[PDB]
Design goal:
This protein folds into two domains: 211 residues, no CATH class; 127 residues, no CATH class. It is 33% helix and 14% strand. The chain contains eleven helices and nine strands. α5 runs antiparallel to α7. The longest helix has 20 residues. Bound molecules: 4-oxidanylbenzenecarboximidamide (P72). It comes from Cricetulus griseus (Chinese hamster). It is a lipid-anchor.
Length: 338
């Protein structure tokens, strides 16, 4: 009943914001640009500083014309509408959003510890306790998102930032969607795609549980379970129903992963009648205090090294390009609801 009532309140609060989204809550010249933190085919993320408060933020800037060209309109509207409505300890907070003649802007909390990906690659692999600490946070986050009828669809180490307490903050809702039943879009990252996405089926939240299996494997091994030089070769491995485990994996870890990396979605943990409880009650999680994780009372495996809220040492270096705003409005109609 405790979990039922928690998730019922969570859904009520989400739906109120979902139905009446916030809009136009800052503007670009309220911020100073500090550094580019990441780049993609239609946008970038920039460390900015608010000129009046001095607070640092990560500002995601999407070029409207590129969003249209790369057929990402609905996805960008999903991302903003979802992010402004969610509230969970392991989800990055959206603080402002706005648009101008050229771009869409989402201003989010800045997490100076950087991406899990960097730390994983620096250390090689995480011990099982360390992987389990992060995995537990993802399990709770997916329990929350799925109870709101949301599918995340982009779980991977680059989208999980490590905060000042060593806890995860999930970023990048670009593929997240509110789904009743099935959805069909081909999206994600090749190594993390569930078989039913590769096979062009209508799929559901089970794809997030598959991706959790991939993430746990990668955290504990140092490399993902399905790897190859070309995506088609990765996809052949994903659909095959075969996975090999390093000998150092515990038996409990192997068993959990066989049930998350189950090619038959109707047999996959997280998608059975007992839902998330098949995962939470698995022996690999026997040492996990779920409430203590949620309350952020567990001491983390490591605290990232950084000097202060504006330090960018844990992020890498990108060419610094202009944020140009056209004199003329672009794509106004397509982005009316943003
Ligand atoms: N670097 C960050 N703190 C960050 C990155 C991406 C994002 O979508 C949100 C926040």
């Amino acid at each position: 009943e405790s979990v039922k009532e928690f998730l019922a309140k969570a859904k009520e609060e989400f739906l109120k914001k979902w139905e009446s989204p916030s809009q136009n809550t800052a503007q670009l010249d309220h911020f100073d640009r500090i550094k580019t933190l990441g780049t993609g085919s239609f946008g970038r993320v920039m460390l900015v500083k608010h000129k009046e408060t001095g607070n640092h933020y990560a500002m995601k800037i999407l070029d409207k014309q590129k969003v249209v060209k790369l057929k990402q309109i609905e996805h960008t509207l999903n991302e903003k509408r979802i992010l402004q409505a969610v509230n969970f300890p392991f989800l990055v907070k959206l603080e402002f959003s706005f648009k101008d003649n050229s771009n869409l802007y989402m201003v989010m909390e800045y997490v100076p510890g950087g991406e899990m990906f960097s730390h994983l690659r620096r250390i090689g692999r995480f011990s099982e306790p360390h992987a389990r600490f992060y995995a537990a946070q993802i399990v709770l986050t997916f329990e929350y998102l799925h109870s709101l009828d949301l599918i995340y669809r982009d779980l991977k180490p680059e989208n999980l930032l490590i905060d000042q307490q060593g806890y995860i903050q999930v970023t990048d809702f670009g593929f997240a969607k509110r789904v009743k039943g099935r959805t069909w879009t081909l999206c994600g990252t090749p190594e993390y795609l569930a078989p039913e996405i590769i096979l062009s089926k209508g799929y559901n939240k089970a794809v997030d549980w598959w991706a959790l299996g991939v993430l746990i494997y990668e955290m504990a091994a140092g490399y993902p379970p399905f790897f190859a030089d070309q995506p088609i070769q990765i996809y052949e491995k994903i659909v095959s129903g075969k996975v090999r485990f390093p000998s150092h994996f515990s038996s409990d870890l192997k068993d959990l992963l066989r049930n998350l990396l189950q090619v038959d979605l109707t047999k996959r943990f997280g998608n059975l009648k007992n839902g998330v409880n098949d995962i939470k009650n698995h022996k690999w999680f026997a040492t996990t205090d779920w409430i203590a994780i949620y309350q952020r009372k567990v001491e983390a495996p490591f605290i990232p090294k950084f000097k202060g809220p504006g330090d960018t040492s844990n992020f890498d270096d990108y060419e610094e390009e202009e944020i140009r705003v056209s004199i003329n409005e672009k794509c106004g109609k397509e982005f009316t609801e943003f």
